[PDB]
C-alpha cells in the first residue's frame with residue numbers, strides 16, 4: 001500500500017533528505033482521503049496517528065483553559081499529529097478539514113522510523129514548539145501612563161501581521177535598528193519571524209492584536225552562554241518604558257535558556273538604548289565608526305524592576321515555550 005518516495009519528497013520536513021532515506025517510511029504509511037468538513041483529530045484524544053498533507057487544507061483549533069480557541073491552519077507539505085507523538089501526550093488541538101484533503105498517514109511505528117531519518121526529528125521538534133507557542137497565554141502588561149498591552153512570543157504570522165498592520169515604524173526607527181531606513185526585505189522578515197526559541201528567542205508586545213514592539217536574543221555560535229540582544233519599539237509607543245520592560249522580560253527568558261551574558265551593539269548616538277544598558281552597566285567599547293558595543297551579565301534575581309508576580313508570569317510563559325517539547 002506504501003507511498004511513492006516522490007509522494008513524500010515535497011513535504012517540508014523531508015527537504016534536503018536523500019531519496020533512499022525515505023524508503024522505509026514510504027513503506028510504513030497509507031493514503032488518506034477526507035472530505036471538506038471532516039474531523040481528523042481531537043484535543044483530548046491519545047495519539048496513535050500522524051498525517052502528511054498532499055492536498056487541501058485543515059483548520060487547527062485549540063481550546064485554552066480560558067476557554068477561548070486559538071485557530072491556525074495546516075497546509076500541504078506539513079505534518080500534523082506529530083506533536084502529541086513527540087511529547088507522548090494528548091492531541092494539542094482539534095484538526096478539521098477545510099478543503100477536501102490527501103492523504104499520507106502513519107502510526108506510532110511509521111513515526112519511529114520517521115524520527116530516525118537524520119535531521120528529521122530535529123525539524124519536527126523545532127516546528128513543534130514553534131506551533132505550541134500559539135497556545136501560550138499572552139501576559140497583560142500595564143505601563144506607567146496607563147496604556148495597556150500584551151506580552152507573548154513571536155509567531156511566524158507576526159511577519160504578516162506587521163507588514164500589513166496599521167502600526168508605523170519610521171525610517172529613522174528602521175535605521176536605528178537595522179542601520180537602514182528602508183523597510184526590511186522579505187528574507188529578513190522571515191528571519192526575524194521563524195525561530196526555534198532555543199538559540200533564538202523573541203518577545204513581542206501588542207496592543208492586543210497587532211505587535212507594537214519586540215525584543216530578541218540570538219545565542220552566540222561559538223559561546224552558547226552569551227547571546228546578542230536587540231529591540232524594536234514602534235514610534236508612538238517609544239519612550240513609555242517598553243524597552244526597559246522588554247530587557248527585563250528578555251532577561252527572564254535568557255535565564256531559562258541557559259544564557260548568561262548579553263552582548264549589545266548600537267549607534268553611538270542612540271541614547272535611550274545606551275541608557276537602558278547603563279542601568280545594568282556596563283563599559284562601552286568602540287566596535288566601529290559611530291558604532292559601539294558592550295557585554296553584561298544577565299540580571300538575574302533581585303536586579304529587576306519588573307515585580308514578582310510579573311517575573312513569575314513571564315518566566316512561566318517563557319519556560320512554557322522553551323521546554324514545551326523537551
Ligand SMILES: CC(=O)SCCNC(=O)CCNC(=O)[C@@H](O)C(C)(C)COP(=O)(O)OP(=O)(O)OC[C@H]1O[C@@H](n2cnc3c(N)ncnc32)[C@H](O)[C@@H]1OP(=O)(O)O
Pocket residue numbers: 172173174176177229230231232233234237238239240241242243244245264265266267270271272273275276279
Ligand atoms: C541592542 C539594540 O537593540 S540597538 C537598537 C535598538 N532599537 C532601536 O533603536 C529602534 C528604534 N528605537 C527604539 O526602539 C527605542 O525607542 C528603544 C527601544 C531603544 C528605547 O526604549 P523605549 O521603549 O522607546 O523607551 P524606554 O522608556 O524604555 O527608555 C529607556 C531609558 O531611556 C530614557 N529615554 C527615553 N526617551 C529618551 C530620549 N528621547 N532621550 C534620552 N533618553 C530617553 C528613559 O527615560 C529610560 O531611562 P530611565 O529608565 O533610566 O529613566
Ligand SMILES: Nc1ncnc2c1ncn2[C@@H]1O[C@@H]2COP(=O)(O)O[C@H]2[C@H]1O
Pocket residue numbers: 041047060072073074079080081082083084085090091092093094095130131132134
Ligand atoms: N499553530 C499550529 N500550526 C500548525 N499545526 C498545528 C498548530 N498547532 C497544532 N498543530 C497540529 O495540530 C495537531 C493536533 O494534535 P497533536 O498535538 O498530535 O499535533 C498537533 C500539530 O501537528
